Design a protein around this nucleic acid. Structure first.
Ligand SMILES: [Zn+2]
Lengths: 94, 107, 362, 98, 80, 95, 108, 81, 98
DNA sequence: CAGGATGTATATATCTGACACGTGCCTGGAGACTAGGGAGTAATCCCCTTGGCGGTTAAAACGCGGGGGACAGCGCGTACGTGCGTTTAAGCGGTGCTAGAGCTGTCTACGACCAATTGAGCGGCCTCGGCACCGGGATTCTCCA
DNA sequence: TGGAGAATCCCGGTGCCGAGGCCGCTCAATTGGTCGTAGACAGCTCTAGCACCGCTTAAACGCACGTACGCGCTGTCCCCCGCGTTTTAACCGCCAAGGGGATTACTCCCTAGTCTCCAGGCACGTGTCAGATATATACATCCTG
């Protein structure tokens, strides 16, 4: 009677993608929620700050990309940027 | 003559939810407007990072001849990555334990 | 008539007597190579020989002057891309690897260039064996159509050993195998989880070149699990031991493998049939086999003809699943012409109706 | 005579044991008592969820372990194996809490 | 009502072992007890502030998690 | 064209002459004061935003600002700043 | 009608601008609505803090026989106050220098 | 440009050390200081260049630097803040 | 013979002089050259405002001074007066940059 | 060295409770359309960045003598670790209780929105006073019998 | 415990440039009014923190023995510091050219807002199997004559 949402469905799907024989405890699935929420808040705060510095009023893919380049280290940023660009390219073909 | 719905995560080809992140972006006081390609990018990044951690986590789980991933395995995954350990340098994991190390002088 | 079969196996055991000395001398030089490769400075620091046993049941072998070993090399984070949508050939890429991949010179863009890496391997192995001349051992290079570097040893006489590179991945047994190795109802789920928690292997082999990307294709290898199952061939893991019951499983495997070996070599048009065919068929027969009493040397001939029946029924309906990759089923006409399989059926009938004459050699 | 171990072997065994576990190393009733007594200075008649106290205990143990690591580093620096309050004070001064 | 002596000496030895410490002077315990007390005072001050703002009587896990996150010591595993 | 920009220099000057009627100030010190005021303004505003968001509310009130000030400043600075703020709010509500 | 205007800081009795702070609070993406007494709190606290800094800074500038504040005096003020040094603990002051302090073991 | 880290002369590391309060300095300290300064500068300039490129400018302004420092916990007063 | 000062007096005078100034202690052309050369790896044909380089110089000098303070503290801890790279490494390890 | 005692990882047998499915459903996400406003673009100015030159002197660089500090070695004694026997109290399970959190409904005061005035704050101009800056004597402070 | 060199502050005069004041102006805060909605109360539920009681037993504690480590002393030997000479190249002033940020004007397309609808995610209920535990072995390591 106090319906509260989380990310565990999608985390479970991704897990079944990368390791389709492994389970997960009930505390680790809370830890993944906390992790996702943390990264979400970081990226969103950084994109907000970026849009404020550039006198814009909207948040676009360019802000998200620059925020990711600001926050991820080394080859993580390269792979994340490639993933993001591939995703946007696939979405626009619709 | 309807257009039976097709989720945005399906269009992007992702598992993470695009509409829920869109809603959280709008009701979160981040900007006045939100573009159409920002949630796809962010969900792709979140899914990539999740897969990147979870694979090494299932590996650390399956190293100790275990079936379920526990927090000890998540912690070992975090600390055994010279970038993930810099991204999560000041985070504490409950029931995570410590990194096994002994100083050479103490042997 | 199981007595002649038992004695031909004994004949192989006197081969085995010759091949203990031949295999020991070749084994010792390759072991020496192993010791030397760990000391030389190159991208090949940790390269073990993969031990699949020494028996004929354990390794590639034929006429006494060729031996085979598997060399393993651990590889960083690997992502596979199916190229043969059967599910048998792949393109190889890497993953993030934040510190650095000491293999980037082996890649054409984002894909690993098997050609370049194999050329560097060939060069290094040939130079290293060239650097110590205790036993007379040299390298022979044939056309680069099958990637194996063969040493020729003059000790006592010609010994050839094809060194086959195998990539070592510990990651996840990719999705193409997800419902391979079905043994849950025969042995148990705990072995299968433990077995499938083992690593898997990638070997260079240029899939016949109706393709652009050449050399850059790889085949799956599961030699270690296959050896493990074979040396625990029974529902009881005590097989081949004093703790258990003598059965005709290893005997039937040798009977069919050796019979096919001799019959197929004497009619050389059918050389596309390799030893993996018999291992796959016998894997299916041993898994469907519920009874230990259905494999016992007193039943060598009956288990063998039942196995023959299994082989003909497998040929008949035009499908034999790769036991680890049911989606990749090699019995497709595009790689084995139907008429050639039926000709093999006729040759098999030839063996069955003549009372095993090919065994009547010496 | 019986089986006297030399000083430093049981210490290494305990190091190896506690670098492998994940349990909590402080008793729970003393910690809860201490928490309630400390909190009764900022406001009286307070209540605590059990999860809150468990979180506090986890955080404090992680903090103290992370501080003992730097104390050990300082000890190694001073050409010693025994840790001394000088080293704790140096650690907390460099970390920035002073 | 000391209750700071309830942080015993064996417990401190265990915490030192987990941190890779072999020998411990005898004057280390009262100082690390004071350090821990200082840390707890800060965290509980912030947690009770978060609790009082909601006009509540009980301290929840979220108040502690927020008080921790605002000192750069984020904690995963207790909600949020 | 001339692109008017804002700063807190007038009010810093008023406060200075009101607390020290005789001393002057350089211009780089005024820049430092601007950076300081903007910094801690931002700090308080972000903390109060987060607090209001945690408690399901959608308004920022003097209570939120009060507890954010209690969170950020240490010891007696918070006590005296809270006294100043509350006194000012009382005076204001009295119109 | 339309009685003479009176700034909100005039009623509050302050020198900091209540209208500019109201606008900056309404444009900074902090919440949907902003109460009427929140800018009063914020202007009072900012004014208190700046006056609290400027008192020590003018004192420090006079203790050097100078009638004009420079960045060096602001840092001297900050590093000299025990409570202001915890607030601006992770702040760099341009042209500020350090506090003259020599360890006792180094003196002759 | 090459060999510019050597323009941080030893008497300048010495002057910085004097301002730091140290009385006696070894002779191998200077290479360590050059390396630390180089990696610090790299880490800061990477972020400053990220901000500048995002802004689609070709000159690095002082606000880009101020933001790159602020995002590392090294807020800097006196250049616009 | 003339007026040889003993080792450590001119060092103290320089300490007292540089703890009283606020100027910049690094030459400006070398710093600017180094900055431009470092920046030409992330993107070519860049330009710099003078104020940006001045800010960078101020920040870097403040950083290095703040690090030398902790190096001195570590030196004092090790019962020495000479600073050594071990102490810099310890400082940067405790501070958290590794 | 070489055995002996001890500690720890390793195999089995059993049960459990924690995880994995499965179902009902409701709320939030998707499709379609409109109306505005944010952003993309093109041109232009004019600021400011880059590039050069010449002279100086302050700083760097190189050398040198020497004293003091780093470092090694030896001894001692003491403080901390190991082991044992007692004792306390922590933890666990179960019970009961009620304060207070959490939800629900009502309404009311307060904040959004709009249009018009108006003064506060910004940009520019001018001016004096605080501060460099140089001399020049005072006065510390170091180096000796 | 002196007496002389030598930095360094302090005063004093000059001069200069930057703060402080004036003036002109413009746009944003104020006033006055309207409207909608967030939140404040009042009630009611019902969780879950609190208090208690036994009971077991593991952990703390106190004590003795012993050993190895910190610390202190001594002696040595480099190596940094203080000083003197040379050189070089930042630095300042300066001039020149041009690139690009910043402003204006113009245009378009993408998102909010509304409305209708329906599927995915949540809560609830099962079913079962990974793991915790207990027992029996064997291997690994330390230790001492
Ligand atoms: Zn057998």
């Amino acid at each position: 009677r106090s319906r509260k949402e989380s990310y565990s469905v999608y985390v479970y799907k991704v897990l079944k993608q990368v390791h389709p024989d492994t389970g997960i405890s009930s505390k680790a699935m809370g830890i993944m929620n906390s992790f996702v929420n943390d990264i979400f808040e970081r990226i969103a705060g950084e994109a907000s700050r970026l849009a404020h510095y550039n006198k814009r009023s909207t948040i676009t893919s360019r802000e998200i990309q620059t925020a990711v380049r600001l926050l991820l280290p080394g080859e993580l940023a390269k792979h994340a940027v490639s993933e993001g660009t591939k995703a946007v390219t696939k979405y626009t073909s619709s | 003559a309807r257009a039976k719905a097709k989720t945005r995560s399906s269009r992007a080809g992702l598992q993470f939810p695009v509409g829920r992140v869109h809603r959280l972006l709008r009701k979160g006081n981040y900007a006045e407007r939100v573009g159409a390609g920002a949630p796809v990018y962010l969900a792709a990044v979140l899914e990539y990072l999740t897969a990147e951690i979870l694979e090494l986590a299932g590996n650390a789980a399956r190293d100790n001849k275990k079936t379920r991933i526990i927090p000890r395995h998540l912690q070992l995954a975090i600390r055994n990555d010279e970038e993930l350990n810099k991204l999560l340098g000041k985070v504490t994991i409950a029931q995570g334990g410590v990194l096994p190390n002994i100083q050479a002088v103490l042997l | 008539e199981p007595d002649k079969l038992k004695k031909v196996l004994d004949k192989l055991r006197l081969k085995r007597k010759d091949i203990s000395e031949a295999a020991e001398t070749v084994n010792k030089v390759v072991e020496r190579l192993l010791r030397r490769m760990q000391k030389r400075e190159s991208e090949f620091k940790g390269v073990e020989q993969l031990n699949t046993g020494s028996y004929y049941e354990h390794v590639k072998i034929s006429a006494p002057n060729e031996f085979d070993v598997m060399f393993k090399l651990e590889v960083p984070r690997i992502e596979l891309q199916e190229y043969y949508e059967t599910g048998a050939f792949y393109l190889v890429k890497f993953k993030r690897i934040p510190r650095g991949n000491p293999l980037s010179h082996f890649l054409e863009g984002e894909v690993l260039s098997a050609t370049k890496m194999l050329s560097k391997f060939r060069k290094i192995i040939k130079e290293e064996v060239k650097e110590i001349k205790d036993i007379d051992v040299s390298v022979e290079k044939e056309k680069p159509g099958s990637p194996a570097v063969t040493l020729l040893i003059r000790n006592p006489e010609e010994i050839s050993v094809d060194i086959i590179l195998a990539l070592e991945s510990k990651g996840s047994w990719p999705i193409s195998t997800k419902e391979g190795l079905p043994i849950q109802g025969w042995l148990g789920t705990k072995v299968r989880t433990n077995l499938r928690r083992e690593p898997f292997y990638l070997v260079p082999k240029n899939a016949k070149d109706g393709n652009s990307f050449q050399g850059e294709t790889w085949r799956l290898s599961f030699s270690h699990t296959e050896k493990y199952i074979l040396n625990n061939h029974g529902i009881e893991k005590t097989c081949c031991e004093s703790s258990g019951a003598k059965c005709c499983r290893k005997e039937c495997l040798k009977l069919m493998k050796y019979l096919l070996e001799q019959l197929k070599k004497e009619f050389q048009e059918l050389d596309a049939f390799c030893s993996y065919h018999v291992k796959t068929a016998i894997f299916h027969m041993w898994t469907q086999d519920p009874q230990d009493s259905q494999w016992d040397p007193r039943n060598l001939s009956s288990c063998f003809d039942k196995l023959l029946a299994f082989f003909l029924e497998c040929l008949r309906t035009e499908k034999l699943d790769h036991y680890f990759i049911p989606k990749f089923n090699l019995f497709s006409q595009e790689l084995i012409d139907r008429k050639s399989k039926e000709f093999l059926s006729k040759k098999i009938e030839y063996e069955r109706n003549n009372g095993f004459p090919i065994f009547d050699k010496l | 005579k019986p089986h006297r171990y030399r000083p430093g072997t049981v210490a290494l065994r305990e190091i190896r044991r506690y670098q492998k576990s994940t349990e909590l190393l402080i008793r729970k009733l003393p910690f809860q008592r201490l928490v309630r007594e400390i909190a009764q200075d900022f406001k009286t008649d307070l209540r605590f969820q059990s999860s809150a106290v468990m979180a506090l205990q986890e955080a404090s143990e992680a903090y103290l372990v992370g501080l003992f690591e730097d104390t050990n580093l300082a000890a190694i620096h001073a050409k010693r194996v025994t840790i001394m309050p000088k080293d704790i004070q140096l650690a907390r001064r460099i970390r920035g809490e002073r | 009502r000391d209750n700071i002596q309830g942080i015993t000496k064996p417990a401190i030895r265990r915490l030192a072992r987990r941190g890779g410490v072999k020998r411990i002077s005898g004057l280390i315990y009262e100082e690390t007890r004071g350090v821990l007390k200082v840390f707890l005072e800060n965290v509980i001050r912030d947690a009770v502030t978060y609790t009082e703002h909601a006009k509540r009587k009980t301290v929840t896990a979220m108040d502690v998690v927020y008080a921790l996150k605002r000192q750069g010591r984020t904690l995963y595993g207790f909600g949020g």
